[PDB]
Design a binder for this molecule. Structure first.
Ligand SMILES: [Zn+2]
Lengths: 192, 4
């Protein structure tokens, strides 16, 4: 099946932490990632992108220590810094196990799909969220998925969140089609 | 490149 192929591709992308961690929840995260179109997963694998699952804070990892005390883009005024943030995506992907669900220190519909969408945007699609075409869609639809001072202000955030709605499950896919029809069509066409 |  296509889901099994996607799990095989993810086996060459996902990295588990050293030490004790919740293996069942790490498996559940992989299973949710396996719903992403295989073409994107294959491209991530070819670029040697790793999806790092973590059992502690992101900034406790040596490669993210430099973000200690840094206020993420869009998180101004929250009293929080990267120390508090459970997921990161872009040139790399790093994710705290257990923090997938919306509301666990973040507002994404799913942590791992949202972070991985940033990596797909940046690595696979050469920052398409900042293209004129997507900016035009974002101008119209970017306040229709909640969190207007974040998703509605940063097109790369609206891209990542939309991508997560499209791929998490049938209900979020349906909600995106209703709320953001142009974004939905854009994502459908990208995966063709 | 990094994004929350
Ligand atoms: Zn984001």
């Amino acid at each position: 099946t296509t889901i099994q192929q996607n799990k095989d591709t993810l086996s060459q992308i996902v990295v588990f932490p050293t030490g004790n961690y919740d293996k069942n929840e790490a498996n559940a995260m992989v299973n949710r990632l396996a719903n992403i179109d295989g073409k994107y997963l294959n491209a991530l694998k070819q670029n040697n992108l790793k999806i790092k699952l973590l059992s502690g804070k992101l900034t406790d990892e040596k490669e993210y220590a430099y973000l200690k005390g840094v206020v993420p883009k869009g998180w101004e005024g929250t009293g929080k810094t990267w120390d508090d943030v459970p997921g990161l995506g872009g040139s790399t992907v790093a994710l705290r196990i257990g923090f997938s669900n919306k509301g666990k220190g973040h507002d994404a519909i799913n942590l791992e799909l949202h972070a991985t969408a940033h990596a797909i945007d940046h690595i696979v699609l050469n920052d398409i969220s900042k293209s004129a075409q997507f900016k035009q869609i974002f101008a119209k639809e970017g306040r229709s998925l909640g969190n207007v001072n974040y998703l509605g202000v940063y097109p790369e955030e609206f891209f990542a969140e939309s991508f997560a709605y499209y791929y998490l499950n049938q209900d979020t896919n349906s909600k995106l089609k209703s709320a953001c029809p142009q974004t939905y069509s854009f994502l459908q066409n990208l995966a063709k | 490149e990094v994004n929350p």
